[PDB]
Ligand binder design. Structure first.
Ligand SMILES: CNc1ccccc1C(=O)O[C@H]1[C@@H](O)[C@H](n2cnc3c(=O)[nH]c(N)nc32)O[C@@H]1COP(=O)(O)OP(=O)(O)OP(=O)(O)O
Ligand SMILES: Nc1nc2c(ncn2[C@@H]2O[C@H](COP(=O)(O)OP(=O)(O)OP(O)(O)=S)[C@@H](O)[C@H]2O)c(=O)[nH]1
Ligand SMILES: C=C[C@@]1(C)CC(=O)[C@]2(O)[C@@]3(C)[C@@H](O)CCC(C)(C)[C@@H]3[C@H](O)[C@H](OC(C)=O)[C@@]2(C)O1
Ligand SMILES: [Cl-]
Ligand SMILES: [Mg+2]
Ligand SMILES: [Mg+2]
Ligand SMILES: [Mg+2]
Lengths: 330, 189, 189
């Protein structure tokens, strides 16, 4: 019995990343994706340095000397085919070392910056090697935008799945419909940590709010009134840090959070700060109100607190899904 | 249940033909509004006959644009010659009536061979039609053809098994679409 | 087949569709696309069964272009002309309704006109109903050159609409092959 799962969600929600786990989990080409990793590393650093001066208030380096390295990273910013000369990794690391550069990093929400930022930047020493071979984690972390639809076909216990990845961006959403007809279920992805950020499309719409109106649009769709949604609340890790860090309070982006009190059926993971528990379930219920409004029991919504980069968490949740697909006879 | 049931179906290996009363308005400016409608109906009446003979299938009539296709309803591996023949008939046919019309007219045929998607759309006033990029190319072929000649694709030629004398259609220079997609075109002799 | 003296013909096309159409293995070779279009064409027909449009006749569908006509149910006298505009809006309301659920931005383009036509059938094989008349040729040309989300009306059509509570704007001159150059207008909203 073959299925067709369509992953939907806004941009950088983590769709592409989940399909990766499916290959990691149920399916030497790396030599090609090394490039993409160095490009991330480059965009990451040049984005941070670029925001340094534009932010309000501006961010000044702790090293006046590093001002020359700043000029470098910029002079090469727009550069077509970068050779990644051995110097790059030096000035780059030097800047990542700079306290002001990081100061600016802790405000990366005030500008568009990829997620693998800190991850990759913390390993310039490794990526620069000519013998550098990406680990499985460096692929789950690599970031490439998706344009169009691509179908991954894997198998589990002699059961077929046909994974569908589409562009989370807006101009991409128009291609979604081409997969709407005859689909087992929908895997809706949400950037649970991106509550204090805005989308790349217009730099104003809250990434989370966008993910909400998008979910509302799918749930209340005239062609998905019976198709069940498996809500994947992703980036829990990035979320928890933000919650504990406490630099940007949630009830300042979503005021309704102030009046929110942690659930009853709440099953917090082993050793989990109540503050986090409270936060993550907030975000989940926010989505549940959308799915509770309509639907009329013709289709249901099964949330999950997932972490696409963790092949361990994805292996787990993908099973709680495979169960639903069988248990519900979908 | 979710989407309306669609009455379509993919059909590979088929030849598509389009025709046009070249300079229709050039004659539409001398014949009574009715004489044109009779002439037009006269013409296609004969066409449809020719059509059923040559194993073709009239799909729809759009003013001076007539287009059928072979390979349907039941898949005939001979879908190549059928349209070529059809094109042949439509050529002489229009010439016979070109007399009764008492005016200068000629057909511009275009033929391409590929796969389609046929059926009906919406839910009211149904009319059998066809859809595919191949269907578009065939139309554009007709558009970029020559009076009295039958324009075809290299795809349509690979189905004629060297049974027809052809020459360079150079459609790339007559129609933009052919140019854009660099489509080798030829003309039956 | 008879001929009328005042029939209101309308053309509503979706220019943005030819591009939307894709033939990839993902979309079953352009099936899923035609599926969406089928929804659209169907959503449009669900208007013909409404009381206020009980006088509209869906003549056919050319590509992604809807062809209707009002005033064929006869032997103000020009009120069926305003209903064709009431219908044009109708299609829009529905074309953008679809955009909500498809994450698209399809825009409709209209070309309305009115005058003498020649209703009737054509084709020996499977006779199909269609109206002719120069009036139809201009209506189509009033669309191919129209502007998205704008209805294009001719002078007299412009006039009749004003005497019906409509405000208009002059698009400028436009070349209608066969009739030369003609001054057109955009209906205001
Ligand atoms: C004075 N004109 C007429 C008098 C009585 C009946 C029809 C006409 C008339 O102007 O017919 C035109 C369209 O209404 C009419 N037509 C087009 N599509 C349709 C269609 O879908 N339905 C109907 N009924 N008529 C259509 O056919 C004609 C062809 O015009 P095209 O713009 O299609 O140019 P062309 O096909 O390349 O010929 P051309 O002059 O280079 O050579
Ligand atoms: N830290 C962390 N990073 C994650 C997590 N899930 C995804 N990412 C990172 O987020 C970035 C964007 O992920 P991606 O899967 O490309 O989004 P997408 O939905 O596929 O977006 P698109 O490709 O349609 S525009 C990647 O760099 C990936 O490594 C998570 O749970 N934690
Ligand atoms: C509907 C989609 C699409 C892309 C598919 C297609 O093969 C067509 O329907 C044909 C070629 C095809 O159906 C044969 C008839 C006709 C009238 C020639 C159509 C139009 O040119 C369509 O374009 C327009 C302008 O609607 C076109 C090109 O549009
Ligand atoms: Cl998101
Ligand atoms: Mg993606
Ligand atoms: Mg012609
Ligand atoms: Mg024509």
């Amino acid at each position: 019995a073959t299925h067709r799962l369509l992953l939907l969600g806004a941009g950088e929600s983590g769709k592409s990343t989940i399909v990766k786990q499916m290959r990691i989990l149920h399916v030497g080409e790396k030599a090609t994706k090394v490039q993409d990793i160095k490009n991330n590393l480059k965009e990451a650093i040049e984005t941070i340095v670029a925001a340094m001066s534009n932010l309000v208030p501006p961010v000044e380096l702790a090293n006046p000397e590093n001002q020359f390295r700043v000029d470098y990273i910029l002079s090469v910013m727009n550069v077509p085919d970068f050779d990644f000369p051995p110097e790059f990794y030096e000035h780059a690391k030097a800047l990542w070392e700079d306290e002001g550069v990081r100061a600016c990093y802790e405000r990366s929400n005030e500008y568009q910056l990829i997620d693998c930022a800190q991850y990759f930047l913390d390993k310039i020493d490794v990526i620069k090697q000519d013998d550098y071979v990406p680990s499985d984690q460096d692929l789950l972390r690599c970031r490439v935008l998706t344009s169009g639809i691509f179908e991954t076909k894997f198998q589990v216990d002699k059961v077929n799945f046909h994974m569908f990845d589409v562009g989370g961006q807006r101009d991409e959403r128009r291609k979604w419909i081409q997969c709407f007809n005859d689909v087992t279920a929908i895997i809706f992805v949400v950037a649970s940590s991106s509550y204090n950020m805005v989308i790349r499309e217009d730099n104003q719409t809250n990434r989370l709010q966008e993910a909400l109106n998008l979910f509302k649009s799918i749930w209340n769709n005239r062609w998905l009134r019976t198709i069940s949604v498996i809500l994947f609340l992703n980036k829990q890790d990035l979320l928890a840090e933000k919650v504990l860090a406490g630099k940007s309070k949630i009830e300042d982006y979503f005021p309704e959070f102030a009046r929110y009190t942690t659930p009853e059926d709440a099953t917090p993971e082993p050793g989990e700060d109540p503050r986090v528990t409270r936060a993550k379930y907030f975000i989940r219920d926010e989505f549940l109100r959308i799915s509770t409004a309509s639907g009329d029991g013709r289709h249901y919504c099964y949330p999950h607190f997932t972490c696409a980069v963790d092949t361990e968490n994805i292996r787990r949740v993908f099973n709680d899904c495979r169960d639903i697909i069988q248990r519900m006879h979908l | 249940m979710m989407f309306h049931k669609i009455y379509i179906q993919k059909h590979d290996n088929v030849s598509i033909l389009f025709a046009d009363i070249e300079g229709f308005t050039s004659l539409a400016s001398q014949c009574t509004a009715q004489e044109l409608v009779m002439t037009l109906n006269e013409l296609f009446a004969r066409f449809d006959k020719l059509a059923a003979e040559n194993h073709c299938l009239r799909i729809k009539i759009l003013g001076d644009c007539y287009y059928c296709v072979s390979g349907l309803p039941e898949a005939r591996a001979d879908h190549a010659h059928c349209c070529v023949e059809m094109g042949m008939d439509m050529i002489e046919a229009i010439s016979l009536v070109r007399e009764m019309t008492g005016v200068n007219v000629n057909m511009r045929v275009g033929i391409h061979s590929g796969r389609v998607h046929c059926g009906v759309l919406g839910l009211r006033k149904w009319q059998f039609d066809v859809w595919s990029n191949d269907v578009t190319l065939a139309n554009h072929m007709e558009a970029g053809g020559k009076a009295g000649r039958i324009h075809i694709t290299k795809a349509t030629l690979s189905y004629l098994n060297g049974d027809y004398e052809v020459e360079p259609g150079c459609g790339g220079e007559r129609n933009a679409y052919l140019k854009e997609h660099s489509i080798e075109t030829f003309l039956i002799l | 087949h008879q001929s009328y003296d005042c029939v209101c013909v309308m053309f509503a096309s979706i220019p943005d569709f030819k591009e939307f159409y894709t033939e990839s293995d993902v979309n079953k070779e352009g099936l899923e696309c035609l599926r969406l279009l089928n929804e659209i064409i169907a959503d449009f027909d669900d208007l013909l069964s409404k009381p206020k449009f009980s006088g509209v006749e869906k003549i056919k569908t050319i590509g992604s272009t809807y062809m209707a006509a009002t005033g064929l149910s006869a032997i103000r006298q020009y009120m069926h002309i305003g209903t064709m505009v009431e219908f044009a809006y109708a299609l829009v309301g529905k074309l953008d309704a679809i955009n909500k659920h498809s994450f698209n931005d399809f825009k409709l383009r209209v070309g309305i006109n009115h005058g003498p036509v020649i209703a009737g059938v054509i084709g020996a094989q499977k006779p199909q109903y269609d109206i002719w008349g120069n009036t139809v040729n201009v209506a189509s040309r009033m669309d191919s050159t129209g502007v998205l989300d704008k209805i294009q009306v001719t002078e007299e059509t412009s006039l009749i609409l004003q005497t019906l509570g409509y405000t208009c704007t002059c698009r400028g001159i436009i070349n209608v092959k066969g009739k030369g150059d003609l001054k057109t207008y955009f209906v205001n909203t």
